[PDB]
């Protein structure tokens, strides 16, 4: 199963120019393109090895789509400021995320088209792709307008066909890097916190995609509410990391195992100290 | 590739 997603961010900065617009595009957890209106010569640019091959028409067409989009977001931002009765002096943020999730057959499982204003839900296209969820009374203004113009029907074309077709192209380009999971390497560390307790930390490193489960067990049952987890974090070279830690009685470290669940594993690893 | 599709909120 796979997905392609575009993420758009416009940020107003009154008195210091026109809004900044940045976009990034992802296939699953791999970023492959960017656009930043504040660059020297703003244009779409490659960010993964397998997209570089694309010709100048690719880059030109997309670059023109982003510049056009950015200009409409300047008007949307002014509209939004008005709906919420806000001042002209404040910086505000409009974010947008859209794209397609496909299953094993390669056809659409789920379409996405959603928006936030100042970091909170504004409006989202529902999974039937025929109706919207407005977040508050301001957003119902947009909803009424978009219902009247038949926005959802118009959006379905890209989300069902074109989105899906590009995703397939890109899976072809990327091959292993995109289609074969890179399993978690691992380690277990141990650190006494006193003469009667220690920390055991389970480490999961250089993995891809980001989805993973790390679980501490004692004698078999999970150690649910006494585990510290850190957010999954990017390694900096397209892989991910996580750790989970539990504090245990000294001399009992033998009772504890760390179960690691990731798509790149033939079977759930079981680690010990 | 991004969509060729334009709107106002």
């Amino acid at each position, epitope marked *: 199963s796979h997905s392609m997603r575009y993420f758009y961010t416009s940020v107003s900065r009154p008195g210091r120019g026109e809004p900044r617009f940045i976009s990034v595009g992802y296939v699953d957890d791999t970023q492959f393109v960017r656009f930043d209106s504040d660059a020297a010569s703003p244009r779409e640019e490659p960010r993964a090895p397998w997209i570089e091959q694309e010709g100048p028409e690719y880059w030109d067409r997309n670059t*023109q789509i982003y510049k*056009a989009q950015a*200009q409409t977001d*300047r008007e949307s931002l002014r509209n939004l400021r008005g709906y919420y009765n806000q001042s002209e002096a404040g910086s505000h943020t409009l974010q947008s995320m859209y794209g397609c999730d496909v299953g094993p057959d390669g056809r659409l499982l789920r379409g996405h088209d959603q928006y936030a204003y100042d970091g909170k839900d504004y409006i989202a296209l529902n999974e039937d792709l025929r109706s919207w969820t407005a977040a508050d009374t301001a957003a119902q203004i947009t909803q009424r307008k978009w219902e009247a113009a038949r926005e959802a029907e*118009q959006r379905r074309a890209y989300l069902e*066909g074109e989105c899906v077709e590009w995703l397939r192209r890109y899976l072809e380009n990327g091959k292993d890097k995109l289609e074969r999971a890179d399993p978690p390497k691992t380690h277990v560390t141990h650190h006494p916190i006193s003469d009667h307790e220690a920390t055991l930390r389970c480490w999961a490193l250089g993995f891809y995609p980001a989805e993973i489960t790390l679980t501490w067990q004692r004698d078999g049952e999970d150690q649910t509410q006494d585990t510290e987890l850190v957010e999954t974090r990017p390694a900096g070279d397209r892989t991910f990391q996580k750790w989970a830690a539990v504090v245990v009685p000294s001399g009992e470290e033998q009772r504890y195992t760390c179960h690691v669940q990731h798509e790149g594993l033939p079977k759930p690893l079981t680690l010990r100290w | 590739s991004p969509r*060729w*599709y*334009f*709107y106002y909120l």
Partner: T-cell receptor, first 101, second 115 residues
């Protein structure tokens, strides 16, 4: 210059072509200020509204417009426009249609 | 009274070397405006366009002309030094948005340049 003469009541078909890859094609009419008639998107093969039916074939880079049961006020020149980037249209050569009584 | 694009003047004669301003106004609150010229029996050619107040850019045949867009409602076209090649019908148009939107046209200004 392309020209087409018919009798009121008959159907009229007109064609246009274009040169680049596109996202949409719009037919317009002009007689007497252009007025738009119908828009078709590059994912669509046929669309209709009232007496008009438009078709599009992106392999051939061509579109046809069919007016069912032509009337005197259909007499006009008919043109196509296609996108040239998100913000601009490029317009082609018309077809002059004359609907005779 | 309807919404639409209006233009003045309807008709103009200019001597070679004279200058002129064609006015275009619309009341549909459209951000995107366009100027075209059309020789009789021929197609439209884009001169300049504007995506919003304070923004203009060149079309296919910009030479000989300039525009400005200080408000949303108006898009004036300036003819700087008339030459015989500028005899034509000049059409202003507007639309609501980029992408899948049709344009609305003004009635046209018919210009004859004469020695």
């Amino acid at each position: 210059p392309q020209a087409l003469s018919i009798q009121e009541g008959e159907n009229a078909t007109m064609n246009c072509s274009y040169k680049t890859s596109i996202n949409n094609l719009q037919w317009y009419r002009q007689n007497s200020g252009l007025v738009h008639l119908i828009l078709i998107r590059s994912n669509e093969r046929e669309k209709h509204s009232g007496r008009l039916r438009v078709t599009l074939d992106t392999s051939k880079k061509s579109s046809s417009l069919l007016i069912t049961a032509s009337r005197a006020a259909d007499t006009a020149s008919y043109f196509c426009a296609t996108d040239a980037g998100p913000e601009k249209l490029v317009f082609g050569k018309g077809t002059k249609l004359t609907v005779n009584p | 009274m309807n919404a639409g694009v209006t233009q003045t003047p309807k008709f103009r004669i200019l001597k070679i070397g004279q200058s002129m301003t064609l006015q275009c106004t619309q009341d549909m609150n459209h951000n995107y405006m366009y100027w075209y010229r059309q020789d009789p029996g021929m197609g439209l050619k884009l001169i300049y366009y504007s995506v919003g107040a304070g923004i203009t850019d060149k079309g296919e045949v910009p030479n000989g002309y300039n525009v400005s867009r200080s408000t949303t409602e108006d898009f004036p076209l300036r003819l700087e030094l008339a030459a015989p090649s500028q005899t034509s019908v000049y059409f202003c148009a507007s639309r609501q948005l980029a992408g899948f939107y049709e344009q609305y046209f003004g009635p046209g200004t018919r210009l004859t340049v004469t020695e």
